[PDB]
Design a binder for this molecule. Structure first.
Ligand SMILES: [Ca+2]
Ligand SMILES: [Ca+2]
Ligand SMILES: [Ca+2]
Ligand SMILES: [Ca+2]
Ligand SMILES: [Ca+2]
Ligand SMILES: [Ca+2]
Ligand SMILES: [Zn+2]
Ligand SMILES: [Zn+2]
Lengths: 91, 91
């Protein structure tokens, strides 16, 4: 696999790892999302230590209102954070 | 970096590699897009050997009509292919 291909597979993997912990195994509940951010985005996003932050993040990414992050919504979240990384550095 | 973080950086890298070849260094023209697909998505997408295919792919991903793929549009493309990978395997 190319680096791009590897990257795509890594997005699927991390989503499955976390989504599979509780409840619907193809969606991230707030707790799962919190830990994904805290463990796997520790360089790109401030650690979440407040309920109000978990709440706001989920509210922001949860486009279908079910209170969880599904795969499509996780893809959008990844794009948001990737874009923020891209922009953060002037080039 | 986590695997997720690495993946995000890899998306930015591959986009820059290809977008930087010609013209606007932050957009993929048809030729750049063709080679990105052919070289870096060789396991996930059929090799592009026809103009009509390059044309259709660009038309499909080009949401702002400028005839190129920008970073946002590339993110959407990556999500599309990642999703197709995810679904292709029943689990
Ligand atoms: Ca879950
Ligand atoms: Ca389990
Ligand atoms: Ca949702
Ligand atoms: Ca270009
Ligand atoms: Ca050059
Ligand atoms: Ca465009
Ligand atoms: Zn850039
Ligand atoms: Zn799955």
């Amino acid at each position: 696999m190319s680096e791009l291909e590897k990257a795509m597979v890594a997005l699927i993997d991390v989503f499955h790892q976390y989504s599979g912990r509780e409840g619907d195994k193809h969606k991230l509940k707030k707790s799962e999302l919190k830990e994904l951010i805290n463990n796997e985005l520790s360089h790109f996003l401030e650690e979440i230590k407040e309920q109000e932050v978990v709440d706001k993040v989920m509210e922001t990414l949860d486009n279908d209102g079910d209170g969880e992050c599904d795969f499509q919504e996780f893809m959008a979240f990844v794009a948001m954070v990737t874009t923020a990384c891209h922009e953060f550095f002037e080039h």
